[PDB]
Structures are given as C-alpha cells and as structure tokens.
C-alpha cells in the first residue's frame, strides 16, 4: 500500500533506504493525528512525483 499509493521504488536505482525507530521522536500522549498519507488510488504510480 506504500509502494503503489504514495511512492514506489524502481528495481534499477542507485543508493538504498536507511531506517530507524522513532518512538522517542514521534510518540505523544495526546495521540499522533498530525501525520497524513494516501491509501486510495485507481492505478499504479509513475516514478518520483507527489
């Protein structure tokens, strides 16, 4: 759902992905409602656009 509705990754691309944990940077006692995304699209995604 992230590789078809928000941003896909080409098979032949340079570089890679670095990831970590954001429990001490994103979690709040009032809830995490500020962040938004997309999860509905009729078709697939062309490379590198928003």
């Amino acid at each position, epitope marked *: 759902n992230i590789a078809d509705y928000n941003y896909k990754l080409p098979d032949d691309f340079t570089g890679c992905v670095i990831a970590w944990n954001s429990n001490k940077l994103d979690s709040k006692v009032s809830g995490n*409602y500020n962040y938004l995304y997309r999860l509905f699209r009729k078709s697939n995604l062309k490379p590198f656009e928003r």
Partner: antibody
Amino acid sequence: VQLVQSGAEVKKPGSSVKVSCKASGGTFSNYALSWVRQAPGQGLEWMGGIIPIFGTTNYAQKFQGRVTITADESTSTAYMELSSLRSEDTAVYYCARLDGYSFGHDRYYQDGMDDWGPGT
Amino acid sequence: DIQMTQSPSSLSASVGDRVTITCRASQAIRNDLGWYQQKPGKAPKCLIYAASSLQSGVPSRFSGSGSGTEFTLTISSLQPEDFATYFCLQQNIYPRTFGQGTKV
C-alpha cells in the same frame, strides 16, 4: 467496546421483528454498525450498516422498503425493525461495529472485529 | 444485485497436510481484504486484518494468500479446534459468501 445484542422475539408472524444492539464502552460516532443474519441451513449474508452522524443508510437487495434502522448520535444503542413476517424468517441475528471512515480524527481504518453479539 | 460465487466448501484433510480453502473473485479490491470464522453457537471472530497481515491473537496456522481474482486459506499443520465456517470479505457493497469446514 463490547456489543450486547437483544433477546429473542416472537416467532408468530403477523407482526414485526426488532433487534437491538448496545455498544457498551467506546461510544464513538460515524462508526458503522453492520447487521448479519445466520441460518442453520444457509451461510451468513449482509443486510446493512448504519452510520449515525453522516446519515447514509445504504441497504442491500431483496429487502428494501421493509427495514427501518435507527441509532443514537453518540452510538450507544441501535435498533432495527423489520416488518412482513413470513414462514422463512427463522434465523439468528448478530451485530458488529463495522469499521468505516472516521471524520473526527481519521484514526483507524479497521481496528479489528472484536465486538459481536453474544447470541440469543 | 450480483452474486460473488465460490468453490464448494467440501474441504477436508488430515493432521500434517495442507488445506487449500478457496475463495474466488470476479473483480479485484485491495483495502476490503479480511476473513471471518464462526463455530456453531458462538460469536464470529475476525481471521485476518488484511491479506498481508494477521490478527493480533492468532497463530501462523491460518495463512491468507491473495492479491487478485483468487484467494486461498492455507494451513501448515491442522488443529483439532479448526471445526468452524470460514467466509471471505470482498467488495464495498459486501456480498457475503458460504463456508463450511470439517476434517474427515
């Protein structure tokens, strides 16, 4: 959140059948409440899910014009009244809070169907 | 309306085999994936959150594999408490299906 369904109704035809479901705890608006019918000789089938605040009350085929569904604005209790009792209305009714879009917080797309009718 | 048909539910296997419970599809949907289970006399239970996710509180016995017009429930090794009825969930208008399961 926990769902408690209503008791047994009258088996004799000529009147209406009423099913009630109470969502104790977590009374949140815009959560759909779906009703399902289960038979000993037939699989379960969907009829409708009620949304309290948006007002959309979309039904399914072959029972339109015979059902009236109401619910409180802050969820709590929900009632479904169905008229035109016939000889093929022997079944059991279950209710589940159907996970739809939430406009107030956009929080959960589908929390997990954990609440259901206990069975009467 | 329309009916979303299925293969017959006369599926049975011994302990240690692979079950191939089949739910067909005439269309394709993504965010409506999910299965329900029902033992006779008890409340229904959700089987999977989606096709790629499992329920919080289920083992890896049930696996739901499906991305297009076919959907399968697969068992690595069977359990004596598997005797229930399984129903796949498809389409926004929600046409429910038929399910039956008994090892014999």
